[PDB]
Symmetry: C2
Subunit: 123 residues, 2 copies
Amino acid sequence: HSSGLVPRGSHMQEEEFHKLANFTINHLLEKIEDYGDNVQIDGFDIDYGNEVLTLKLGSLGTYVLNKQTPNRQIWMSSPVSGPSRFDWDRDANAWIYRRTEAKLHKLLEEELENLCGEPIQLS
Amino acid sequence: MQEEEFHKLANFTINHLLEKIEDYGDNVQIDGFDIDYGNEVLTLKLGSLGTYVLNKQTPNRQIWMSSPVSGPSRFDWDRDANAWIYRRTEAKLHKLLEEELENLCGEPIQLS
């Protein structure tokens, strides 16, 4: 909660990072948009622009996701768990927060069900 | 803090910041400068240097910021100082952004 851009030697080439990150973020936008149609959250609003993904859950809070290209990471701010950073794991084929080993899609699945009462499948 | 009062101040603080960083981008030369606001989120892309994100967290009555230099922070409104404060470090929101942009872009800025 004090450092930002930290150098690393296992540097995924910028081209490969954009493919994986663009595909993952696009998948999330489509599936969470369907989620808003099947549940009724007062103030629901998901949108993408200037490389940031924004999910407003009304009075429940706001999710923010964005690419941090210098670090080769996806960054997320959550109303439930705060900040986290995700790296691509070539052996698991998923985005992982190494401080806790939580997978990105499974974490959003777990938190959204607790907040809105209905399940979602982002895997 | 009343939810109504939180929305007033936070909209004022974020909007004030947006206009001043737009003027700053015109008077300095940053390759890839791009600032924008939409759906209550403020985004500052400094090209290859990274991306700032600021947004209101209404349940907590806080402004949240993600920085490529210092990472995450949370700000509360202090009625005696008239500023947003990160209580873990006592940093003011506008003074913190002033220091990092000057270090990054070489020119000073006035966000107060």
